Amino acid sequence: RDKAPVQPQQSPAAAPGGTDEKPSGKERRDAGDKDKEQELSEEDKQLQDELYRPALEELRRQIRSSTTSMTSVPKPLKFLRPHYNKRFAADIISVLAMTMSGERECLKYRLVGAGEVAKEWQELDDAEKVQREPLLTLVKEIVPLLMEIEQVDMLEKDIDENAYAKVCLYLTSCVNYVPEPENSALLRCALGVFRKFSRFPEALRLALMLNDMELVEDIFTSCKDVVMLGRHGVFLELSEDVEEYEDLTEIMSNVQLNSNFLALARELDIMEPKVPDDIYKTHLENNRFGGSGSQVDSARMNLASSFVNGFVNQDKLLTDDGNKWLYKNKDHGMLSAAASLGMILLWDVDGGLTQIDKYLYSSEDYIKSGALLACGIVNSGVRNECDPALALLSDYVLHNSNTMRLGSIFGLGLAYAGSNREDVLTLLLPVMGDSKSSMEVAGVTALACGMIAVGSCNGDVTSTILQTIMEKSETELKDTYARWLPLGLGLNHLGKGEAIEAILAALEVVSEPFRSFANTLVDVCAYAGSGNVLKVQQLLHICSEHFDSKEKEEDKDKKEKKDKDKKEAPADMGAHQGVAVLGIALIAMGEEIGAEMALRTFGHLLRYGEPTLRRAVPLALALISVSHDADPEVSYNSIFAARLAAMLRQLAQYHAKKGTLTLCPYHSDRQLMSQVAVAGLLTVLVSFL
Amino acid sequence: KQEEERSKVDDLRGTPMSVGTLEEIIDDNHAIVSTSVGSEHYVSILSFVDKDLLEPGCSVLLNHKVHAVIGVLMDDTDPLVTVMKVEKAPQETYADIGGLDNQIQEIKESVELPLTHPEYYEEMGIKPPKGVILYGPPGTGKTLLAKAVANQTSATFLRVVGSELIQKYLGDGPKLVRELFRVAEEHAPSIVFIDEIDAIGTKRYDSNSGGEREIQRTMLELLNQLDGFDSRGDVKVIMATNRIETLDPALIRPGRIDRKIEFPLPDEKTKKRIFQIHTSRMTLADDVTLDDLIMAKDDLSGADIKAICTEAGLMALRERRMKVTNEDFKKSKENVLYKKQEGTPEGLYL
């Protein structure tokens, strides 16, 4: 109707006209009024007036909430103590209490730091449990633990909307936009409601982000309570890091309850179903052995081809293909070929000893040292290959068993990940105290103790890596030491959630840009990735640093950091000119499934002239795809047809055919512009089943 | 610093700079430059730019006064590459099966199956079809089936119109052939499509040089490039026309184009489906019988059916009627065909 009868009712100040007009306005409050509430300029004078004055607070929050305010709007509701499935309930509850209580939670969440906003917050939580459309109420009620009692208060009936919808969008947006400390509340209260619930790989991805040891005991009494079985042994062992299968095999070495979790969840039963079934359902032919194994000769390309043939795995045929192929081979390639029988067969525990045993203790140092390297390759649960190598290791400067130290300290780094294995590190004290002029002694020292030490409890600054810091800064020689020791330093820094070890090594370490490059290595490895863009604008500024190798690793951190929100991962690094930066993006594509935009970047990155960068393209190019596939390969044949390029092409052919185990060895590969002695360890980036 | 070396390279240049088309390597870095009009001194090259980006005979940056080679040409964004390089795999593989079904199978097991599985020639020692002329009456589906294979694909599709190669400059069209087959070479295994090359033979222009001596040279560059040398391998190219009279048989011969594929204007058994589907997305008074329209036009294309099934709705919605009267179909078909003369003759078989 017209506002002529109802409009001058705001003019009197008598109590009965208010106490019946406000219930009369409550009936018309289903649409608020006729219109956009142009009573405001006349009824804002009624502020100073004071029986049913909380109903006057309802009118006042109704009209101030009706037009616009950020702090004075929820003040009549916090003064009101709301009192006295509907359209009106959707109005004053849904949009008005959602937006109004939302700005009260934001304004007091940023302002003060009461219980009133907790009571209103639980009331709105209950009202949106009535409304039952989550998603927006949830993401609003994150920013007020509050979210803990919100989840256990909310979770009674609906499982997959809160679990799938809430835990999907808030897990992804929590690692994406939100900082870290509330993600622990996600993980613990999600451990509560998922502890109530079935389909346990939600809790196993909670074990992925948590890395908790109680969780695997609860999910093994519960996932033994739910008797597939060896398959969750498989992605259990794939999912788990270095620590919790050794803590798991020690507390389950105590209890075990059927001993089949000691069977599955240490080793050997992720791997017993696969390799026969790998032979069975797949049938791989011979003309890539012969054709791709025919790609000419030259003891390099041929040597690489042995590696390519070797990583073929239809039987361990290229293993037992005669003799005179390794006799053509030379020292560090003899390491690569002695380890290549390791690479053909990362299973066959009993067959590993009886195949490598001919090449064990042979006439050649590289055959025996790469042979124990192969013993470290083939398995990770044997630990009886240690002692024939372990006993020999000491040489005190540069004898044979230091190369067995390289293959056996590295291959034993492949072998075990304990709570903290300490006996092998007490063996590692005369290794770094030995300090051979061979790089990969301290190389596989840092990398191997890092593989022992990735997933440490927020890292540690213990005397192991503290000792290799002090003995690192002891000798400033052969800067590959100053690169690959901060490798294993940052590997021990992995396992962090909140580590101040960048500040600790910042105080101990920093100097002339060898150890400032150690500073940027700890800066890389301590910062795995979250919504933490301040180090990304730090990346923007110190990306322009005149020393152009802290540029290399510091800009190289990007594929670790933004690996999930990968749409921003295309950047203009190719549009820059510091050619190692084009190398950095060339790393940053990598190996996943590799969409058309990535191969489109390999359109330009495929065509470059420097042999380390033209060498650098087919590696990640054929890692990212594990004609179509062979079309860029024959395009590389069109590129060259140097020797490096030929080797790079061979590597690409090999490629053609946050788990830390796939995170380490390519950052171990990042110093490739060097000797084949370095490439003798190039075959230790064991990141594929 | 770098600034003085860059300034000295910039002052090796003389600010009125020019562009000329080359022929041949002169291996010891002194060169010789045709222009457009070709006045050719023994020129040099400004030796900090890369001479060996480029194969023999292509445009570079020149000078006007000593004619010397200065810089590499710009990768000149002609209006072709944006159309030639097909951006997205668009749409319309088959919204409606039942249009051809004869040479759908043929184009499948002749274009997809040799290409997408190149391992059957291993068993049986057969060469792939390089060029297939898909042709027939106008308005059949040739462009449609081209787009159908363009979306239903795993190869980088390319789409070329035959009048894209017709520009008035001298040697322009042969250069466009050169960059065209560079586009056809440097993507992937690729499916090139060429259309309207029966609109190139009895054709002369006014924005043009000497007519029979212009695109004889361009189509001869097409001859010497398409299925000449520069080894064929796996590059799919499809050319399409309506008529065959203006075709030089030097390209029709084997080696260059293997399979010859017509398209029949369809039978009434599929006219019922094509008329139905063209009328599938409108309102229509369903009492009317399309079987009159289906039986009537004896050599209908699908553009006929397109214009009929849309223009009858246009004549009805012309006066804002949702559903169509049969005499609006009369008006539609007698607009669409000039003198709808298929009755007697005959008419009187009967």
Ligand SMILES: Nc1ncnc2c1ncn2[C@@H]1O[C@H](COP(=O)(O)OP(=O)(O)OP(O)(O)=S)[C@@H](O)[C@H]1O
């Ligand atoms: N999914 C389909 N299956 C079969 N036929 C179809 C399909 N979609 C459309 N058509 C028909 O295919 C015809 C395609 O017309 P076009 O071949 O492009 O005509 P056109 O472009 O004049 O051919 P020219 O003269 O050689 S350029 C349409 O008129 C439709 O009737």
